[PDB]
């Protein structure tokens, strides 16, 4: 536990980046979280709002 | 493509009963259906067409029931005058069909 | 309409370019998919009534 | 009553239902298929997955 501070810095950066990359799979209230899926599933007029 | 069977082969019941006939299909034919009766030495006559509608001049004792795959022909009362063979016709699709009509069912009334 | 048929479509390729002569004056208004790119799609189960 | 408008006329209606999943595909579109190429930047399309 002597080197807690540097380990804390490294862990903070790693976990923030991991949270950012993992949040990319969030639905945000869409029918699908993959924009490719949205494009091949809907007519444009609603594709813009989704 | 469409094949049917008619059951029972023959029925027998006294004058006060009700006689019923089953006409079942391999696949659904919707309402499209017709019931035919021939007296011996006489051409068949139409009794029930569209599986529900009574024909012209036929007494109100013959009932057709069911839709799709299973169809039943029920007679409320016999008078020993309906003892004949009955057939059911697909009247739905006859592109490549061996016989539009089904099997024979002779009714026997013992009075 | 009350005794509507049900058909299963599977193990085959589905094309829409032929659906003009067989059913003229057709109306394909529908929901849940863009009809413009039905050419490049795959379907697990198709039911025709 | 064919004398009246189309509202008193027979209309044949055919209803199609899909599931639209890209993995157990058995009914696909009429577009052809092309041989795959490896180790190259390509825009693929696998059973509707682009």
From Swiss-Prot, chain A:
Coiled-coil positions: 7-50
Described function? Subunit of the fusion protein that is processed upon entry into the host cell. Mediates fusion of the virion and cellular membranes by functioning as a class I viral fusion protein. Contains a viral fusion peptide that is unmasked after S2 cleavage. This cleavage can occur at the cell membrane by host TMPRSS2 or during endocytosis by host CSTL. In either case, this triggers an extensive and irreversible conformational change that leads to fusion of the viral envelope with the cellular cytoplasmic membrane, releasing viral genomic RNA into the host cell cytoplasm.
User: What's the name of the protein?
Assistant: Spike protein S2'
Q: What organism is recorded for this protein?
A: Severe acute respiratory syndrome coronavirus 2 (2019-nCoV)
Question: Taxonomic lineage per UniProt?
Answer: Viruses, Riboviria, Orthornavirae, Pisuviricota, Pisoniviricetes
Full-sequence range covered: 943 to 992 of 1273
């Amino acid at each position: 536990s002597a080197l807690g501070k540097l380990q804390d810095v490294v862990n903070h950066n790693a976990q923030a980046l991991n949270t950012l990359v993992k949040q990319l799979s969030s639905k945000f209230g869409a029918i699908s979280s993959v924009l490719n899926d949205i494009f091949s599933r809907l007519d444009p007029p609603e594709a813009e709002v989704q | 493509d469409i094949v049917m069977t008619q059951t029972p082969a023959s029925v027998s019941e006294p004058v006060g009963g009700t006689v019923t006939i089953k006409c079942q299909a391999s696949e659904s034919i919707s309402n499209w259906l017709a019931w035919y009766q021939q007296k011996p030495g006489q051409p068949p006559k139409l009794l029930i067409y569209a599986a529900f509608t009574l024909a012209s001049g036929v007494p109100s004792r013959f009932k057709g029931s069911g839709s799709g795959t299973q169809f039943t022909l029920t007679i409320n009362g016999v008078e020993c005058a309906d003892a004949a063979t009955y057939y059911c016709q697909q009247t739905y699709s006859s592109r490549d069909v061996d016989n539009v009509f089904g099997g024979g069912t002779e009714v026997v009334v013992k009075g | 309409v009350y005794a509507w048929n049900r058909k299963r479509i599977s193990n085959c390729v589905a094309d829409y370019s032929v659906l003009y002569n067989l059913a003229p004056f057709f109306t394909f208004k529908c929901y849940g998919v863009s009809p413009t790119k039905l050419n490049d799609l795959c379907f697990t189960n198709v039911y025709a009534d | 009553r064919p004398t009246y408008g189309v509202g008193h006329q027979p209309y044949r209606v055919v209803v199609l239902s899909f599931e639209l999943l890209h993995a157990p595909a058995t009914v696909c579109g009429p577009k052809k298929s092309t041989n795959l190429v490896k180790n190259k930047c390509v825009n693929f399309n696998f059973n509707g997955l682009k």
